[PDB]
């Protein structure tokens, strides 16, 4: 469906103005007829974007109500009402058991539904942001007259007019223009104004001057044009549809959840029906056969687990909110940890998005300035008298000014009225020479010649601030070579000197080096005009050369670039040390893209492209073995004629990849290419041209300050302070939460065994029921909750940023090793500790373990109010039941006591508690509150009716203590083996 939109567009900028009118039945001068425009409206439809059909929240909520655990809990809830119905008909049961348990279980499903619904959130308003880029109104020429109309009423063929400050209402063929410049950052991510004129200037319509696009704005001048595309058919309207239309897809974390749901659901249905038939064979009435099944359901399903996961995710997202990293989708909290490839935009993401002075060439020396936002570098020069001469030209031969009321904000961050290069120079001098306004007050400008297309220079004449002179100084800047052809002397370390071929060659060298760094280079020179030839009232003519512009003194060079953000180089290296592959994907030109790649460490030192090898060896590129080149730089124009299989080979064959001059669909294609190889991919960006890629990414991260509204709609995560170091933190947090989820899951599952085994022995042994159904829910929904959550606050056991990204095909959240430990080893020890306390309670009340076998028949018989114990005493029905429920209560408390040790062992997968310590305060809180809850549930009056919880005698609490301790020792010995031999036996069997 969207495969059409993933392709490069076709256009009609090649046609003549006249020819273009024939195609759209239009007038170049009079414009369309009121009738013809209305006709075309009904024909083509409105100049608007329609949002894609969404899934209502209704269906979204209910889709969770049927996912493995909820299905089993539904079967339980209904099976409760089943047994209740069968009762209400047969023998009038005045009880509330099956009825209430059926109500409780149905509530558990609904509430669990809210948790998973909260986790599976999708806040997407892509198409809405795009719609915000179409103006409310447009100016059209109809019947030879200009009028404002609803922009939706704009059709292909009419004559539109735009001017500085307004949004392009539709894709236009420029037919007339006067000084028109446009901001195409929507399509390129670059905000430098692009001229628009009627002349065709490139075969590529996205590069030609005679096309203006919807989603962009006119920055200055005026233009008229013929509408060629409207609504969804515009270049960026298609990007809108592509972006808004892209299928979301399941996250890595989501896939893991479903996976263990299958496992646990599997064992649940297995043991469920395996013992349902095992009971009927033993001659159990279907009346009972279902009651046992309900218990089996409740025992096997970890009722509180899915909600635990959600809370652990939420708590991890809260910590990241506190580092200026907003998470829109709870699952995106983990994806960053599983990320193996980052596709990053350059401008406004890796870079500050601001032309900044990078180097200066004066005194036959290359000086480097500090490009960082917060200025974390050092000085270059202050002493040289040459510097002050260059500094003066940079301030004086400059027409840029700071906007009013910025004195509060830092120099480099403040808004400037002017072109990017003049702003850069302004901020450079203001920083290291103080107020520039002061320099422009001490040296009043009397005449100037602003930068001309033809002159290729800008000159200014000022009254020298010096009192002993107060004469006229000439300054000029422009193209380095043009400035050179106008110089005779060079200000070396203070004093001038003739411009010999020697210094002239050093100039060329300096010029070539700075240009090689991808930096824009300017020349600077001045000339102190002779006093006798220029009186204090001498008039200077700016129109006609009234003053010399030759034999001037060359002062120096200055170079500039849109520099990396301070934290970016280090963040890139850190991603790469964690084994994450970092690719650059930018709409910017290749020379600039490549230079920043080396600056931030995308391309490491020494690595070459095929073009680099060819130039170094002075040989044809076809003569170069492409396998000798680990780095590559792909232009979008070449990308366009490559198949995906060939794109896949590029991705496979290079470690250091730069995709430059890419369109928005091309970014999507590169992302998909990476994913196709089985990689989890993150995208980082800030422009509307990142929207499709951000949507398709497993996780999209947008910049918060510099980011466009669209990009932040398309993302899963926002960096609110533009701190790229947050990606590094995000991946670290993502890995940590992945491990801690394992700990929390094992902990929760472990207590399933002591809830399952009592029901089994109840059938096979014919003893009184050791633990009840209600009692199970008091564990999974009550006591285990806070402890399970607390594992989310566990510190790393080792340097997680030192390991490679997990293999999502092999490294699962819940594997066989977890089940073996939780179900086969620790849970089994917990089961016994439960049974022990059960036998203790009964034996101390007169029913010794031996006489318990095959007694349930008489025990449950409501009409036998005289059962004989081991000592020959006789018990009524309600009397023995009180002891039985007291058994449920102590078995319950036994679970809590054995979960104490389990909580401590689940703390660490490898390390010892004596190494990791007990610095998790939430965990300790869990221990205290868990025990408080259990005690309250046993001793609070009335709980014997609502939950069948009975007061325990002090000695009862200590039954499971020896089992709780064996768990601690056992797991500590086991992990001691793991560490002592990384070989594999204990490791490959039990290492979560």
């Amino acid at each position: 469906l969207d495969e059409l939109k993933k392709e490069v567009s076709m256009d009609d900028h090649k046609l003549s103005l006249d020819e273009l009118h024939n195609k759209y039945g239009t007038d170049l001068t009079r414009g369309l007829t009121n009738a013809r425009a209305k006709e075309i409206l009904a024909r083509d439809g409105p100049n608007s974007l329609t949002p894609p059909p969404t899934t209502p929240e209704w269906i979204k909520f209910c889709r969770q109500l049927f996912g493995g655990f909820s299905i089993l809990l539904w079967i339980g809830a209904i099976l409760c009402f089943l047994a209740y119905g069968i009762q209400a008909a047969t023998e009038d049961e005045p009880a509330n058991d099956n009825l209430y348990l059926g109500v409780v279980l149905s509530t558990v499903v609904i509430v669990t539904g809210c948790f998973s619904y909260y986790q599976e959130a999708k806040s997407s308003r892509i198409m809405d942001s795009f719609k915000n880029m179409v103006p409310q109104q447009a100016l059209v020429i109809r019947d030879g007259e200009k009028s404002t109309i609803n922009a939706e009423f704009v059709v292909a063929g009419d004559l539109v007019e735009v001017k500085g400050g307004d949004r392009i209402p539709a894709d236009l063929r420029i037919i007339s223009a006067h000084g028109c410049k446009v901001d195409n950052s929507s399509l390129t991510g670059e905000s430098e104004p692009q001229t628009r004129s009627p002349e065709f200037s490139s075969e590529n319509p996205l590069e030609t001057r005679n096309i203006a696009f919807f989603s962009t704005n006119c920055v200055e001048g005026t233009a008229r044009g013929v509408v060629v595309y409207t609504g969804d058919r515009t270049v960026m309207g298609r990007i809108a549809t592509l972006a808004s239309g892209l299928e979301v897809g399941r996250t890595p974390i989501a896939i893991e959840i479903e996976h263990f749901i299958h496992i646990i659901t599997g064992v649940a249905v297995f043991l469920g029906v395996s013992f349902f038939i095992l009971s009927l064979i033993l001659g159990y009435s279907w009346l009972e056969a279902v009651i046992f099944l309900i218990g089996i359901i409740v025992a096997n399903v970890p009722e509180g687990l899915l909600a635990t996961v959600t809370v652990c995710l939420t708590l991890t997202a809260k910590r990241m909110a506190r580092k200026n990293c907003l998470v829109k989708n709870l699952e995106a909290v983990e994806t960053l940890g599983s990320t193996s490839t980052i596709c990053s935009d350059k401008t406004g993401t890796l870079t500050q998005n601001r032309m900044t002075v990078a180097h200066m060439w004066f005194d036959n020396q290359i000086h480097e300035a500090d490009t960082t936002e917060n200025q974390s570098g050092a000085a270059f020069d202050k002493t040289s008298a040459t510097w002050s001469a260059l500094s003066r030209i940079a301030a004086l031969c400059n027409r840029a000014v700071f906007q009013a009321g910025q004195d509060n904000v830092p120099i480099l961050k403040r808004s400037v009225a002017g072109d990017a290069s003049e702003s850069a120079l302004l901020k450079c001098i203001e920083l290291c020479c103080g107020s520039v306004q002061g320099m422009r007050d001490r040296n009043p400008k009397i005449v100037e010649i602003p930068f001309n297309s033809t002159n290729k220079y800008q000159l200014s004449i000022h009254e020298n601030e010096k009192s002993s002179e107060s004469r006229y100084l000439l300054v000029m800047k422009g193209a380095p070579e043009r400035i050179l052809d106008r110089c005779s002397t060079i200000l070396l370390n203070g004093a001038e000197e003739p411009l010999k071929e020697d210094m002239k060659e050093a100039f060329q060298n300096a010029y070539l080096e700075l240009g090689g760094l991808g930096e824009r280079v300017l020349g600077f020179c001045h000339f102190a005009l002779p006093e006798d030839k220029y009186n204090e009232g001498y008039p200077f003519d700016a129109d006609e050369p009234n003053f010399p512009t030759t034999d001037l003194c060359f002062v120096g060079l200055m170079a500039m670039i849109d520099p990396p953000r301070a934290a970016v180089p280090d963040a890139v290296g850190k991603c790469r040390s964690a084994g994450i592959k970092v690719i650059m994907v930018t709409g910017d030109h290749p020379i600039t893209a490549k230079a920043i790649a080396k600056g931030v460490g995308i391309i490491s030192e020494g690595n070459e492209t095929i073009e680099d090898i060819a130039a170094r060896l002075n040989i044809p590129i076809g003569q170069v073995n492409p396998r000798d080149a680990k780095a590559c730089v792909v232009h979008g124009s070449d990308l366009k004629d490559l198949s995906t299989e060939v794109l896949d080979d590029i991705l496979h064959y290079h470690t250091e990849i730069v995709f430059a001059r890419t369109s928005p669909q091309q970014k999507l294609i590169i992302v998909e290419g990476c994913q196709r190889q089985g990689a989890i991919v993150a995208v980082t960006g800030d422009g509307v041209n990142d929207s499709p890629a951000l949507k398709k990414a497993d996780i999209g991260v947008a910049m918060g300050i510099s980011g466009s509204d669209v990009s932040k709609q398309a993302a899963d995560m926002i960096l609110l302070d533009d701190n790229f170091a947050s990606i590094v933190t995000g991946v670290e947090e993502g890995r940590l939460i992945f491990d801690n989820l394992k700990k929390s899951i094992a902990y929760t599952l472990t207590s399933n065994i002591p809830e399952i085994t009592p029901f089994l022995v109840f059938i096979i042994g014919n003893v009184p029921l050791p633990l009840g159904t209600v009692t199970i829910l008091c564990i999974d929904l009550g006591t285990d909750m806070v402890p399970a959550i607390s594992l989310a606050y566990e510190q790393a056991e080792s340097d997680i940023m030192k390991r490679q990204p997990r293999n999502p095909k092999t490294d699962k959240l819940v594997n066989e090793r977890l089940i073996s430990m939780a179900y086969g080893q620790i849970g089994m020890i917990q089961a016994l500790g439960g049974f022990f306390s059960y036998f203790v309670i009964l034996a101390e009340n007169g029913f010794l373990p031996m006489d318990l076998i095959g007694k349930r028949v008489r025990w449950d018989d409501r009409w036998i109010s005289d059962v004989e114990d081991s000592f020959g005493q006789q018990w009524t029905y309600e009397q023995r039941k009180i002891v039985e429920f007291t058994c449920h209560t102590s078995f319950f408390i036994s679970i809590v006591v054995v979960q104490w040790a389990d909580l401590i062992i689940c703390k660490t997968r490898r390390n010892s508690i004596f190494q990791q310590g007990m610095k998790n305060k939430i965990l300790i809180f869990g221990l205290f509150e868990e025990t408080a809850l259990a005690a309250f549930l046993s001793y609070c009056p009335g709980t014997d009716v609502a939950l069948r919880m009975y007061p325990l005698k002090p000695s009862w609490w200590f039954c499971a203590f020896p089992y709780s301790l064996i768990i601690f020792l056992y797991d500590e010995m086991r992990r001691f083996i793991i560490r002592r031999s990384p070989g594999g036996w204990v490791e490959q069997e039990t290492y979560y």
């Binding site: 205290f928 408080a932 005690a935 001793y939 007061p951």
Partner: protein, 39 residues
Amino acid sequence: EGPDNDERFTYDYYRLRVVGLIVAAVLCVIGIIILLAGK
């Protein structure tokens, strides 16, 4: 005692409940203290 051994079939479940609830409360307070050591 002999025929007056009524105490043999008696248990102070009332005190046990009072003590049990005291303990539960104090464990609840202790937990808050440790948690609130930083929020």
